Amino acid sequence: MSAQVMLEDMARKYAILAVKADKEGKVEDAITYYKKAIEVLSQIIVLYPESVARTAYEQMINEYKKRISYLEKVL
Prior knowledge:
80% of the residues lie in helices and 0% in strands. By secondary structure, the chain is mainly α. The longest helix has 21 residues, at 3-23. The PDB classes it as hydrolase. Keywords: MIT, VPS4, archaea, AAA-atpase, ATP-binding, microtubule interacting and trafficking domain, nucleotide-binding, hydrolase. It forms a monomeric assembly.
């Protein structure tokens, strides 16, 4: 209907929220929203492990994990 697109939309919304909170310096909100984005993107990989967009989701996760590592340092 499809489950993949709805989940992508969830992950995108959370990333948008994370980036916004990141810019505003609300470090705590950004961390939690980045983790939500990772959570959702990892669910898509679990459900669609051979999706053509699997390396895309994997790059987004890596990027947000990198972002989280930084934001821990400054809270």
